[PDB]
Amino acid sequence: KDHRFGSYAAIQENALAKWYVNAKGYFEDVANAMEEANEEIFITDWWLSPEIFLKRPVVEGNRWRLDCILKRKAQQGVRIFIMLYKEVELALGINSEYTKRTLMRLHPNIKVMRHPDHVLWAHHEKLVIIDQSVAFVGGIDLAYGRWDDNEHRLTDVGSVFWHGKDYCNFVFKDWVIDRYSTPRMPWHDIASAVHGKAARDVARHFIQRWNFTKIMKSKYRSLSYPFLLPKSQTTELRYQVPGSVHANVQLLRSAADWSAGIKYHEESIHAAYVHVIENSRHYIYIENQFFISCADDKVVFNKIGDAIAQRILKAHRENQKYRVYVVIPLLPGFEGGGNALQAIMHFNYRTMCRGENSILGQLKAELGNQWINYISFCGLRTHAELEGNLVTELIYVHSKLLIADDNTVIIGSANINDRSMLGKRDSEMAVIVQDTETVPSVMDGKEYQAGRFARGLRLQCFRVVLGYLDDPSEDIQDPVSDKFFKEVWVSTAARNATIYDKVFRCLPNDEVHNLIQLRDFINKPVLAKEDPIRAEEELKKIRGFLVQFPFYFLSEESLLPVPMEVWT
Ligand SMILES: *[PH-](=O)([O-])[O-]
């Protein structure tokens, strides 16, 4: 049938849905949903690490370690199906071959596929579906480094939260791991759960890929790899994710012949994103790992960055208040080294501010200097003391999140880049949630009926990044007023950025325009070391994690050197 946005799935009205800010709650609920499975567990991952703990701090021994959960459910008769991305032979990587063997050795009811063969793009969706009745969709893999809570801690010297290989730091530091010298990289991300017919929609995507891959590879043609069947739409599971509310939901994906055997590619995530931006009335809030857009229909093609610029110019033309918040990582992570990092920085900046085609280029040409009233670009950072020394690290924004108007959300695996959005490249999954239940709220000082689901999630985002967890939240209730935008959002991002720059002289920043200035810069003395008493006094004025994004880091470098589309 013909569905909205050309999705493979219909709008499911009054579906029960949940959101997650960071992995702590997500992994706990996944663990409890799996514990209650009776028939089927389906898992997809870009990377899966079998020994991660889903509940922490650890008690009850290995009861909540991922491999032990799967094994005891398989032992009860639950059939477990796992699809892993097959990384290049030359990748240091994801170790999918080892992980497959580990998993299938736990019990015969556990069946694992890897795809694609290389003798290309990737499978990027991160899904857990239980009994085709509860499904989790997000940006969070069941993998090392992902677990985090809203404190985004840099340290763990008792090994209370990140045992062994789970203590990771994927930030580039070779411009030219041991937990006693080096802080971890915190993992900031977003996920969701859906129930009922919506969950059956997630299952259908997983079944389509499973059966497609089964018939395409010799090794999976045997009876031992079951042919999967969708649960009849006529028919649930004795688990409801606590905290869920009813809303209109719709599954969306990126998929194509190579990834799912469909003849015409699907790019319904992309379509949904452009639609939500175009129809927003008050604000959009983006947290995303990448920010590669602004189409020249030669090297970049997706329409999101141009939709943003054009929505702002409409607000200006109608003399309307409209805000765009953009939170991305301060540096790209690597999980080619430095030339890979630089290529992604090229395209992120190309979308933001480098070129007349940039978002800022387009706004300037029509708005000149008034662009500051409409958009703010940020990353995340934090600090701590490690073994008597002040340290800082960026917080990796791994999210793939769009919120509009406190009433519409898109959560999934798709990054703002062509790889995720065009549909023909990496395979991806997202869900759009549109509120049907509203609460009395405020929007530019005016009475406003906000959506239960989207407002709750936007407020939790705000609390995390602005520093209002467990605090009176009056200052953050209105997401578009001059008072909030200037005195809370833009002020926090500038204040924290200034403090971190002064205390740590950390990269990235607006002073370092070329790689040779970088080397000299980092050899200069650092206050955090020279006068820690004073540094610690200055850091007491930090509130939240938000920091203003530096437009001019490696300004003068041509950040390009492998085809371009690998980076875009
Ligand atoms: P994904 O795990 O690369 O965004």
Pocket test for ligand 1, best of 44, 45, 46, 123 (most atoms within 8 A of CB): 46
231 and 348 share a domain? no
Structural domain range at position 282? 266-566
Does 188 map to a domain?
no
202 and 305 share a domain? no
200 and 95 share a domain? yes
CB atoms within 10 A of CB 448: 19
Provide the number of structural domains found in the chain: 2
Q: Are strands 396-397 and 389-394 parallel, antiparallel or unpaired?
A: unpaired
73 and 201 share a domain? yes
What HEC string does 10-79 produce?
CCEEEEEEEEEECHHHHHHHHHHHHHCCCCEEEEEECCCCCCCECCCCCCCCCCCEHHHHHHHHHHCCCE
Cross-strand partners of 378:
327, 548
What CA–CA distance (Å, rounded) separates 544 from 86?
38
Number of H helices, E strands in the chain: 16, 21
Task: Give all strands (DSSP E) within 146-257, no chain letters.
Answer: 187-188, 190-195, 245-255
426 and 311 share a domain? yes
Task: Tell me the CA end-to-end span of the chain in Å, nearest whole number.
Answer: 32
Backbone angles phi, psi at 157, to 5 degrees: -70, -20
At 448, list the tokens. Answer: 């406003």
What CA–CA distance (Å, rounded) separates 18 from 426?
25
Does 112 map to a domain?
yes
Regarding the beta carbon of 288 and ligand 1, being less than 6 Å apart is answered no
Write the CB contacts of 164 (distance below 8 Å, at least 6 apart in sequence). Answer: none
274 and 359 share a domain? yes
Query: Nearest 5°: CA angle at 160, between 57 and 460?
Result: 60
Q: What is the CATH number of the domain that holds 89?
A: 3.30.870.10
Looking from the CA of 266 toward its CB, the CA atoms found within 13 Å total 26
Asked whether 376 and 542 are in contact (CB, 8 A), the reply is no
Alpha helices (H) in 235-321, listed in sequence order? 257-260, 268-279, 304-317
Q: Which residues are catalytic?
A: 124, 126, 131, 398, 400, 405
Asked whether 451 and 434 are in contact (CB, 8 A), the reply is yes
Name the residue among 311, 568, 268, 249 with its Cα closest to residue 416: 568
Regarding the beta carbon of 289 and ligand 1, being less than 6 Å apart is answered yes
Looking from the CA of 533 toward its CB, the CA atoms found within 13 Å total 0
Sign for the pseudo-dihedral over CA of 465, 467, 471, 477: negative
Torsion, Cα 366 369 375 380, to 10 degrees, reads 140
157 and 304 share a domain? no
471 and 553 share a domain? yes
Asked whether 166 and 145 are in contact (CB, 8 A), the reply is yes
Does 62 map to a domain?
yes
220 and 337 share a domain? no
For ligand 1, atom 1, the nearest C-alpha belongs to 124
Backbone angles phi, psi at 439, to 5 degrees: -120, 155
What CA–CA distance (Å, rounded) separates 110 from 455?
39
Task: Give all strands (DSSP E) within 139-276, no chain letters.
Answer: 187-188, 190-195, 245-255, 266-267
Name the residue among 380, 382, 364, 384 with its Cα closest to residue 372: 364
227 and 336 share a domain? no
Experimental technique used to determine this entry: X-ray
Quick one: which atom of ligand 1 is closest to the CA of 124?
Answer: 1
229 and 360 share a domain? no
Regarding the beta carbon of 419 and ligand 1, being less than 6 Å apart is answered no
232 and 283 share a domain? no
At 550, list the tokens. Answer: 């530096």
326 three-class SS = strand
CB atoms within 10 A of CB 282: 18
CA 176 remoteness from chain centre = 30
